[PDB]
Amino acid sequence: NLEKINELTAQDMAGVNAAILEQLNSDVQLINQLGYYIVSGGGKRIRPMIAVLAARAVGYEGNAHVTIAALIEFIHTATLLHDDVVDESDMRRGKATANAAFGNAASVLVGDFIYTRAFQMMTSLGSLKVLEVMSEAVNVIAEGEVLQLMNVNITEENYMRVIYSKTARLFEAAAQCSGILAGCTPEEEKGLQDYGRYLGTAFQLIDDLLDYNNVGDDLNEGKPTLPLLHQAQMIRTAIEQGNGRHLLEPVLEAMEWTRQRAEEEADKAIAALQVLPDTPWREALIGLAHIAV
Amino acid sequence: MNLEKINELTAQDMAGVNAAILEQLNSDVQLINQLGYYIVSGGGKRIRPMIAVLAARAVGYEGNAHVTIAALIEFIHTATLLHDDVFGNAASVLVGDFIYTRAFQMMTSLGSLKVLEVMSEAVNVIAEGEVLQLMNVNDPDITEENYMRVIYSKTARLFEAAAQCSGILAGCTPEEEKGLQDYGRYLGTAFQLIDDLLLNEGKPTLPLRHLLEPVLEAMNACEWTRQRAEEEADKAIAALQVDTPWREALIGLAHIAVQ
Numbered sequence: 001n002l003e004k005i006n007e008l009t010a011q012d013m014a015g016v017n018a019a020i021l022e023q024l025n026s027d028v029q030l031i032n033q034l035g036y037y038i039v040s041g042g043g044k045r046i047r048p049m050i051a052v053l054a055a056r057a058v059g060y061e062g063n064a065h066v067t068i069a070a071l072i073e074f075i076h077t078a079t080l081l082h083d084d085v086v087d088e089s090d091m092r093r094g095k096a097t098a099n100a101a102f103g104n105a106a107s108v109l110v111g112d113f114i115y116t117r118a119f120q121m122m123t124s125l126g127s128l129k130v131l132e133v134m135s136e137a138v139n140v141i142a143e144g145e146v147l148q149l150m151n152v153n154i155t156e157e158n159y160m161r162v163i164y165s166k167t168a169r170l171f172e173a174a175a176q177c178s179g180i181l182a183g184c185t186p187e188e189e190k191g192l193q194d195y196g197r198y199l200g201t202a203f204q205l206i207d208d209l210l211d212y213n214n215v216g217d218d219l220n221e222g223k224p225t226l227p228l229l230h231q232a233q234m235i236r237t238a239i240e241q242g243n244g245r246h247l248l249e250p251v252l253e254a255m256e257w258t259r260q261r262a263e264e265e266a267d268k269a270i271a272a273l274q275v276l277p278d279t280p281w282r283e284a285l286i287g288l289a290h291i292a293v
Numbered sequence: 294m295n296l297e298k299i300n301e302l303t304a305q306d307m308a309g310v311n312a313a314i315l316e317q318l319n320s321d322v323q324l325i326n327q328l329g330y331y332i333v334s335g336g337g338k339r340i341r342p343m344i345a346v347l348a349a350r351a352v353g354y355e356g357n358a359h360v361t362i363a364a365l366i367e368f369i370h371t372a373t374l375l376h377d378d379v380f381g382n383a384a385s386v387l388v389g390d391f392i393y394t395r396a397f398q399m400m401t402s403l404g405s406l407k408v409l410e411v412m413s414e415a416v417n418v419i420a421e422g423e424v425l426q427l428m429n430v431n432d433p434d435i436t437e438e439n440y441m442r443v444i445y446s447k448t449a450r451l452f453e454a455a456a457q458c459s460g461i462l463a464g465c466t467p468e469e470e471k472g473l474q475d476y477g478r479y480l481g482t483a484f485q486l487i488d489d490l491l492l493n494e495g496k497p498t499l500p501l502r503h504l505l506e507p508v509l510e511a512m513n514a515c516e517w518t519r520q521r522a523e524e525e526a527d528k529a530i531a532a533l534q535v536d537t538p539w540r541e542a543l544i545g546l547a548h549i550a551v552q
């Protein structure tokens with residue numbers, strides 16, 4: 001149950017890709033150029049893949065679920081263009097970033113086009129509820145990024161709450177809005193909502209562990225990610241100082257306990273997904289959680 | 294009319310706009326908190342939101358949703374300025390991102406798919422006009438006479454969407470909608486033309502040896518731009534007879550723009 005997902009979701013994932021490329025049709029070449037650069041530059045497309053998978057797991061058989069998948073990837077794509085500017089990164093998972101190749105202003109402004117274009121794509125579906133659920137999702141995420149910019153700083157519960165209510169809100173919306181467009185049942189809606197929130201949290205926790213094993217940027221700016229926290233006065237300083245440069249080698253110490261914590265959530269999402277019909281789609285959906293970790 | 298009449302006749306509507314603006318920017322983060330009082334709600338003329346409030350009340354509106362579009366319109370405008378200040382700061386993008394997203398949220402609260410359809414396209418058009426102008430920097434050759442296509446989709450499309458969406462959200466006749474649409478379209482263009490007058494090099498402005506480069510050295514005092522700006526204003530005032538004190542302000546505002 002790993003390659004089955006791709007094989008099963010193949011037919012529908014080729015439409016989302018087509019839909020994403022359809023939107024890049026501005027008269028301004030730069031928008032299209034930068035757009036083709038990041039989108040066609042290799043990506044695992046979990047977020048649109050959750051969207052299509054969620055809708056057909058509750059019996060949808062139009063094609064609007066590819067559009068909801070497509071604008072979600074646009075949102076995520078627009079988000080990465082802005083994150084590669086604030087993180088001042090040179091390369092995003094392999095090749096160089098858009099700000100490197102194209103400049104900071106172009107990558108920022110093309111992100112605006114891409115996001116606002118996802119918003120028009122959202123309007124055309126004509127559902128006010130999906131517009132509300134996602135608009136607050138992306139505003140909640142945007143506000144937390146401003147908060148991390150202005151205030152550095154933790155209770156296990158509290159830390160997780162932030163992710164549940166902010167960081168992994170796009171994942172949650174992705175699955176929840178997919179089912180809302182497919183006219184699912186309130187019970188199913190929560191399932192997808194819960195599934196999203198949790199699978200995003202495990203994926204977010206799992207993404208904060210691959211930074212150690214572009215290695216070390218979490219440490220190289222004082223960012224309290226779950227592995228980091230727990231003679232260890234050299235770790236507290238960095239967090240408070242806001243700088244942990246030159247410390248990726250002498251950080252092992254205890255070494256994780258976050259993989260089991262991410263597993264908990266991975267399984268947590270699975271539990272909430274047992275409220276909808278046993279279908280290949282559902283199997284695939286559940287399979288993703290396992291693979292997320 | 295005149296300035297004083299306008300301010301006095303819009304004071305009540307503007308107060309709600311500020312409340313809406315302040316009610317939406319009451320986040321915990323101080324950065325966002327201080328932005329609702331600094332460089333907004335005092336100082337500037339704030340014609341944009343002023344176009345919004347008067348456009349709706351000139352067609353017989355008497356709810357309060359026209360104040361929310363006025364606020365989000367200013368939010369849209371603030372976010373572009375924040376994104377245009379970037380080689381660029383992290384704070385300018387993320388506060389812009391926040392404001393942008395907030396504006397979308399406010400547009401959705403109005404429950405009208407048509408303003409969402411118009412508004413959504415409006416912000417996507419101005420976002421493509423910033424990139425366009427971004428690649429039009431340090432280039433006097435390609436600019437030609439297609440520099441009006443950048444000022445329309447960047448500055449004048451937000452005016453148009455403000456008035457036209459104010460009209461639809463007041464349930465107006467389809468040719469009053471086209472009137473305010475053209476009024477925003479033309480006055481917004483008149484606004485930019487007059488705003489490109491004197492200071493900041495490296496920008497192929499309408500007024501046009503050359504050597505487009507980064508250095509403060511200009512003195513040739515030899516205006517068509519001003520004269521051309523007035524023209525559009527006339528076209529803006531023209532399409533507005535399709536009245537009332539609120540309509541006078543709109544016309545008056547146009548005149549004021551070309552002072």
Ligand SMILES: O=P(O)(O)C(O)(Cc1cccc(-c2cccc3c2oc2ccccc23)c1)P(=O)(O)O
Binds near residue numbers: 083087139141391
């Ligand atoms: O959070 P990280 O920087 O660790 C990362 O996951 C990328 C990322 C994840 C989640 C949100 C964001 C992000 C960053 C900057 C701005 C914005 C982000 O998400 C939104 C949504 C809406 C507006 C702005 C932003 C970036 P990474 O790929 O750099 O590891």
Ligand SMILES: [Mg+2]
Binds near residue numbers: 083087
């Ligand atoms: Mg980041």
